[PDB]
Amino acid sequence: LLNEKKKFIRHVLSNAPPGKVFDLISNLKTIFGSNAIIQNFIEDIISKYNEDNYILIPFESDEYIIICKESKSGNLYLHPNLKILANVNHLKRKVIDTTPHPDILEKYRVACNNKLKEYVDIYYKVKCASSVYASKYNLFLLICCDRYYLKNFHASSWRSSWNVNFLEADQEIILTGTIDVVLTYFEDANINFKTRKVFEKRVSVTNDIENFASSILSVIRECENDVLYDLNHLIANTSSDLIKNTRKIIPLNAH
Amino acid sequence: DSLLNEKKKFIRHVLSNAPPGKVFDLISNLKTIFGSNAIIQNFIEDIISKYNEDNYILIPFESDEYIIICKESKSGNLYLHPNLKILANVNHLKRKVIDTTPLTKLDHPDILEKYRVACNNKLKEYVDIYYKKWSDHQTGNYPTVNIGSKHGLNVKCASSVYASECENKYNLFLLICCDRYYLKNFHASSWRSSWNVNFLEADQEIILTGTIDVVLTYFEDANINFKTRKVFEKRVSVTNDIENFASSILSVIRECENDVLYDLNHLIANTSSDLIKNTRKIIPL
Ligand SMILES: [Br-]
Ligand SMILES: [Br-]
Ligand SMILES: [Br-]
Ligand SMILES: [Br-]
Ligand SMILES: [Br-]
Ligand SMILES: [Br-]
Ligand SMILES: [Br-]
Ligand SMILES: [Br-]
Ligand SMILES: [Br-]
Ligand SMILES: [Br-]
Ligand SMILES: [Br-]
Ligand SMILES: [Br-]
Ligand SMILES: [Br-]
Ligand SMILES: [Br-]
Ligand SMILES: [Br-]
Ligand SMILES: [Br-]
Ligand SMILES: [Br-]
Ligand SMILES: [Br-]
Ligand SMILES: [Br-]
Ligand SMILES: [Br-]
Ligand SMILES: [Br-]
Ligand SMILES: [Br-]
Ligand SMILES: [Br-]
Ligand SMILES: [Br-]
Ligand SMILES: [Br-]
């Protein structure tokens, strides 16, 4: 019976629109606070969702932690610009503690980071994070942006994830990307959808560190204007079907 | 206790935010979890009855009749059907009639009832003349045969007029309802058109206030809750002739419903660039 309480908590999270998810969980623990069996079930479920979806967790003023597979370290999460691993609570979405590998990779990682921030800063400027992660050996660039119409009403989530792995170390590179976008209508929060665009582009670079970053950042800017074009024709298409189905509601014969 | 109030806050929040088409499923899941608790069974019943009243829900009555649930029909804990002269006891979770208490009929109706009867007849005629019938919900230029079981619409329509008397001032509430179903039981839309006039017999001018609510609730196989509303407030010239009074009110309703048709037929999709961030993806010209 206590087992049946678990399956429906999942269903509660399944279809709910994104802007509303935070609220419900907050109360779900308070609802089931004495049941440690479903409390551990909840801690498990939220960490996955939060990791699956690149949740932004704010730290101090003007920083963000990105919760995902790629930043996970043990059960903590890496912020590469600072040299810090963070312990977080997934339910509340806040940081609760902080405790701080080729030498050359780091400065390729950095240069991508700095031109990444410059790009987001001019054109994205609402929650907006950008970070570059480095790891048989590739670099990961990431822009996250959550827009709200007002207060807590979700307008969009933009997740743009880019990985490049090097055999040809200095002359030609492979850059793969995924842009995941979630949008909810202000007119109706039950009208919402997710779309995903994949890219696999080859880029020319030199032994120059920053041209390596600038060339990659030139590709992202263009791939992102591309997805955007697709999206604005998907919105208008949907909006237009909404109008068409709404006019079918009029019960009068149509003159 | 503290939890009882937090369980309520949660039940309220989920039923508040749920689109109409998920409410029933949502309630059922709430009962399995909290079903032994008669306080929250009753809390849920209260919340749903008010919800039902807020949405001019239709409950089928006998063959081909409907009770309409809303403030204006409320009588005690019952609901009036003004033409049959029946108070209906309803189950709000089940959306069914569970008892009826007939009113004693009057050999002679007083004058208010004569206004109500006249407004009732013109309201029904109006729907008859101007609302789509079966061949008009057809997806064709012309009325043809509907092909296959699944293909087609089920449409449920109801209208009613209610009368009350507040300190010798009269009041009439006129109401039209249509609900469209895809397949047979997927609720697609509601149309709710509601009209009040508060007036004296001697008045030659009345104020007719109205509200027209259009809600799309099925869209690309999802339950949604896309609402459009237009409110109206019209001065109408009338006389002591009761039937002409009904015709004048009905002429304004005819025009206001035409005005919404025009509005809906001139909505377009916004093609601004900031669409993702744009509060208005649907706009008029
Ligand atoms: Br939202
Ligand atoms: Br950042
Ligand atoms: Br954006
Ligand atoms: Br909404
Ligand atoms: Br209709
Ligand atoms: Br409450
Ligand atoms: Br309970
Ligand atoms: Br019955
Ligand atoms: Br009556
Ligand atoms: Br009636
Ligand atoms: Br029941
Ligand atoms: Br009866
Ligand atoms: Br009577
Ligand atoms: Br008449
Ligand atoms: Br009826
Ligand atoms: Br009718
Ligand atoms: Br549809
Ligand atoms: Br759905
Ligand atoms: Br309004
Ligand atoms: Br008006
Ligand atoms: Br108007
Ligand atoms: Br007169
Ligand atoms: Br008369
Ligand atoms: Br008019
Ligand atoms: Br028109």
Author numbering:
A (entry chain B): 4 to 103, 109 to 133, 156 to 165, 170 to 289
B (entry chain A): 2 to 286
From the paper:
Apicomplexan parasites, such as Plasmodium spp., rely on an unusual actomyosin motor, termed glideosome, for motility and host cell invasion. Actin filament capping proteins (CPs) are indispensable heterodimeric regulators of actin dynamics. Despite retaining several characteristics of a canonical CP, the homodimeric Plasmodium berghei (Pb)CP exhibits crucial differences to the canonical heterodimers.
To gain structural insight into the unusual homodimerization of PbCPαα, we determined the structure of a C-terminally truncated PbCPαα homodimer (PbCPααΔC20), which was the only version of the parasite CPs that produced well-diffracting crystals, to 2.2-Å resolution. Thus, we will refer to chain A of the crystal structure as PbCPα1ΔC20 and chain B as PbCPα2ΔC20. Superposition of the two subunits reveals that structural deviations are mainly present at the dimer interface, possibly to accommodate complementary intersubunit interactions. The 23-residue Plasmodium CPα-specific insert is located between the globule and cap β-sheets (Ser136–Ala159). The base of the insert is stabilized by a partial disulfide bond between Cys158 and Cys179 in the PbCPα1ΔC20 subunit but not in PbCPα2ΔC20. The H5 helix of PbCPα1ΔC20 is broken at His267 and turns back towards the same subunit in a β-hairpin-like structure (Leu268-Leu286), instead of extending into PbCPα2ΔC20, resulting in very different C termini in the subunits. Residues of the basic patch in PbCPααΔC20 are more buried in the structure, not in close proximity to each other, and the slight asymmetry of the homodimer does not compensate significantly for the loss of contributing residues of PbCPβ.
